[PDB]
Design a protein around this ligand. Structure first.
Ligand SMILES: [Cl-]
Ligand SMILES: [Cl-]
Ligand SMILES: [Cl-]
Ligand SMILES: [Mg+2]
Ligand code: NA
Length: 269
C-alpha cells in the first residue's frame, strides 16, 4: 504494498489559525520549510529545507480553510507524489490529515515516509503551541530516488557506474569520490567498494578530520513503472566535527547526489 501514507494530527487551535500556519510562507517557514511562493491553484512553487533538500511542487487546488491539493517531486527528480493537506474542525481541536500517494512506491519507502510526515505534523503542533520556530536545521541522512526506464542500460554495473557517479579509480577499483562545487574539500577517499551487479552497491566515503566514515548504499528495485534507483548516504551527524562543518558537508553531498540521480536518468534515456 500500500503506497498510500496517511498521517493526522489534532491541535487545540481553530481552523483559521491552522490554515494560516500551513499557507502563509512566513509561518510555513517556522515549522516546515521555505516556500519560493505561496501555493496557488494551477501554479508551480518549490519548498526548500535549507540543507540541500527540496521538492518541486505543482499546486492543483487551494480551498481556503479546507484543503491544499498538490503534486511534488523530491529533489526535482523523484517520482510525482499526490499530496493532500485537509483540515477538519472540531469542538475540541482542528485535525490536519495528510495524504501522500505515489503509484508503485516501494514498500521499503513507506515506513520512512510515514515517519517523515509524523515529524512534520509534530513540528506544526509545536509551532502552534509555543509560537517559536520548530524547524529542523539539517537532516542527518541524505536520500533520494529516481525512476528509470526498464531498458538495456542499468546503473549498477562495473562498466556503467562511472557513467553517472562522481568517482574515479585509484589503481584498480574506485578510490575517489568527488564533490565539485565552489567549496572544499573536493576529493574524498572511497573505501570498501562492494558492487552486487544490478542489485546493490555499498561503499564508504572518508571525511578529512572526522571520527568515523560515512556510509553509502545504492539500490535498484524493479517495477512495472520502471526501475527505482535509490541512494542513502549516512553518517554526517557522527563525524565529530563542528555543526557547521557537518551541515555544509551534508548539503554539498546532497547536491552531488541530486546531480548523480539526474545523470543516471539521462544515461537511462
Ligand atoms: Cl558488475
Ligand atoms: Cl533492478
Ligand atoms: Cl543515530
Ligand atoms: Mg538524530
Ligand atoms: Na540539528
Amino acid at each position: 504494498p500500500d503506497d498510500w501514507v496517511r498521517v493526522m494530527v489534532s491541535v487545540p487551535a481553530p481552523v483559521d489559525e491552522v490554515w494560516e500556519a500551513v499557507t502563509d510562507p512566513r509561518r510555513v517557514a517556522q515549522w516546515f520549510g521555505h516556500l519560493s511562493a505561496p501555493m496557488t491553484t494551477g501554479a508551480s512553487t518549490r519548498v526548500d529545507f535549507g540543507d540541500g533538500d527540496f521538492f518541486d511542487i505543482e499546486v492543483d487546488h487551494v480551498e481556503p480553510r479546507d484543503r491544499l491539493l498538490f503534486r511534488w517531486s523530491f529533489l526535482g527528480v523523484g517520482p510525482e507524489c499526490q499530496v493532500g493537506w485537509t483540515l477538519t474542525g472540531g469542538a475540541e481541536a482542528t485535525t490536519l490529515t495528510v495524504d501522500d500517494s505515489c503509484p508503485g512506491r516501494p514498500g521499503s519507502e513507506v515506513a520512512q515516509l510515514k515517519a517523515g510526515w509524523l515529524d512534520f505534523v509534530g513540528r506544526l503542533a509545536r509551532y502552534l503551541e509555543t509560537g517559536k520556530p520548530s524547524r529542523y536545521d539539517w537532516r542527518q541522512e541524505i536520500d533520494g530516488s529516481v525512476v528509470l526506464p526498464n531498458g538495456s542500460w542499468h546503473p549498477l554495473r562495473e562498466e556503467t557506474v562511472v557513467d553517472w557517479l562522481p568517482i574515479a579509480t585509484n589503481g584498480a577499483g574506485p578510490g575517489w569520490f568527488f564533490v565539485v562545487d565552489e567549496e572544499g574539500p573536493r576529493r574524498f577517499t572511497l573505501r570498501d567498494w562492494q558492487l552486487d551487479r544490478e542489485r546493490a552497491l555499498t561503499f564508504a566515503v572518508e571525511i578529512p578530520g572526522a571520527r568515523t566514515v560515512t556510509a553509502c548504499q545504492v539500490r535498484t528495485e524493479p517495477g512495472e513503472r520502471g526501475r527505482t534507483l535509490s541512494v542513502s548516504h549516512q553518517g554526517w551527524h557522527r563525524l565529530g566535527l563542528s555543526d557547521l562543518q557537518e551541515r555544509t558537508l551534508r548539503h554539498r553531498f546532497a547536491a552531488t547526489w541530486t546531480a548523480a540521480l539526474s545523470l543516471a536518468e539521462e544515461c537511462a534515456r
